[PDB]
Amino acid sequence: STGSATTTPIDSLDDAYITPVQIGTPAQTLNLDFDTGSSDLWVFSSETTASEVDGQTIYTPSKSTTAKLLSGATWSISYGDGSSSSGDVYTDTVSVGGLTVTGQAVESAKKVSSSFTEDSTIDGLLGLAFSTLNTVSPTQQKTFFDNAKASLDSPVFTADLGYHAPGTYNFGFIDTTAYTGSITYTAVSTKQGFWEWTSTGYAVGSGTFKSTSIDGIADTGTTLLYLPATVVSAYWAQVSGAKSSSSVGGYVFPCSATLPSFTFGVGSARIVIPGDYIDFGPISTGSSSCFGGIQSSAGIGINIFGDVALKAAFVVFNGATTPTLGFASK
Ligand SMILES: NCc1ccc(C(F)(F)F)cc1
Numbered sequence: 001s002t003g004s005a006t007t008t009p010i011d012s013l014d015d016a017y018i019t020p021v022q023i024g025t026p027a028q029t030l031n032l033d034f035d036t037g038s039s040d041l042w043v044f045s046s047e048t049t050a051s052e053v054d055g056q057t058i059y060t061p062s063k064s065t066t067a068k069l070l071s072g073a074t075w076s077i078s079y080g081d082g083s084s085s086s087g088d089v090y091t092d093t094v095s096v097g098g099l100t101v102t103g104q105a106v107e108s109a110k111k112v113s114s115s116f117t118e119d120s121t122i123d124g125l126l127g128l129a130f131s132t133l134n135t136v137s138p139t140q141q142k143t144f145f146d147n148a149k150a151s152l153d154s155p156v157f158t159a160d161l162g163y164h165a166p167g168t169y170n171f172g173f174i175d176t177t178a179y180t181g182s183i184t185y186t187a188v189s190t191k192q193g194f195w196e197w198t199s200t201g202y203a204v205g206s207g208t209f210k211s212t213s214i215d216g217i218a219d220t221g222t223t224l225l226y227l228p229a230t231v232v233s234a235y236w237a238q239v240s241g242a243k244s245s246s247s248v249g250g251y252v253f254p255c256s257a258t259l260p261s262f263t264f265g266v267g268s269a270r271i272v273i274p275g276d277y278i279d280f281g282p283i284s285t286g287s288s289s290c291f292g293g294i295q296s297s298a299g300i301g302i303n304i305f306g307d308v309a310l311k312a313a314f315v316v317f318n319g320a321t322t323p324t325l326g327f328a329s330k
């Protein structure tokens with residue numbers, strides 16, 4: 001079997017992408033943030049503290065004839081940005097673009113942090129990292145991808161994120177019409193539960209390519225590109241007036257500047273991120289200082305190839321017994 005669903009930016013900056021997901025019987029459609037950096041499927045629900053819901057569509061297990069409470073199971077998750085949420089667990093039928101999984105763990109939020117409440121467009125997250133990171137206790141649960149794997153034509157899913165435009169998540173097949181040239185595959189380490197890989201280097205604009213190993217994770221759930229301080233300094237040194245701002249919390253640049261592209265290596269292949277992808281607009285309404293889409297990972301502890309990088313490519317998440325990541329230009 002296969003599945004295919006359109007994913008849409010939530011705002012004019014591509015801060016996140018939402019994908020419609022059908023939960024329960026009859027279907028309740030929620031717009032979920034597909035997150036290859038986490039492994040919990042959790043949703044706003046009829047159980048969420050009422051003052052913490054502000055415009056989200058909620059899942060109501062009592063209205064689903066297939067929903068079963070997972071007795072004694074709880075979940076609690078903290079994301080690298082300081083966001084958090086927690087609740088109890090149901091099992092229900094979950095479908096993504098025609099692909100159906102029965103008995104999927106659906107984690108019902110009882111409490112969510114303020115950053116989730118303020119995001120009216122995101123009804124929850126669908127985690128697509130490895131199931132070892134799932135936070136359900138005392139019995140760990142599998143991700144949607146892991147549950148669907150056996151029935152997929154091929155144990156893969158692909159992320160084709162758009163720049164200021166809709167894109168596609170496919171499950172079970174590779175759309176050979178969606179990319180140019182060849183797909184370059186690279187080894188994945190699952191030892192931390194992430195889609196962790198090693199980039200072979202980088203270049204700034206039309207500059208010389210620097211061969212150097214950059215270990216990082218492919219994370220559709222993170223907006224920006226977080227890279228080591230040396231690399232990020234080399235990039236912003238090429239933008240007149242750019243500086244690192246402690247009050248803003250990262251590199252800013254004059255909004256009148258034109259940004260150079262950024263190239264990262266995948267084996268012997270190269271993915272080019274156009275400079276316009278790195279512009280995230282004024283730091284505050286009306287400001288002439290703009291926020292950069294490439295930032296330092298020094299405070300994070302790990303390099304993150306987030307949406308800024310992934311939307312420049314067609315990305316294959318190959319969940320075979322030896323998992324790999326594929327990157328193609330598009
Ligand atoms: N998108 C989920 C996510 C968020 C943060 C991290 C961090 F901070 F641990 F790198 C990994 C994965």
Ligand SMILES: NCc1ccc(C(F)(F)F)cc1
Pocket residue numbers: 016033035037038079080081083115116119122221222
């Ligand atoms: N990396 C996972 C993640 C995704 C979105 C959010 C937001 F936008 F709701 F804050 C937090 C954490």
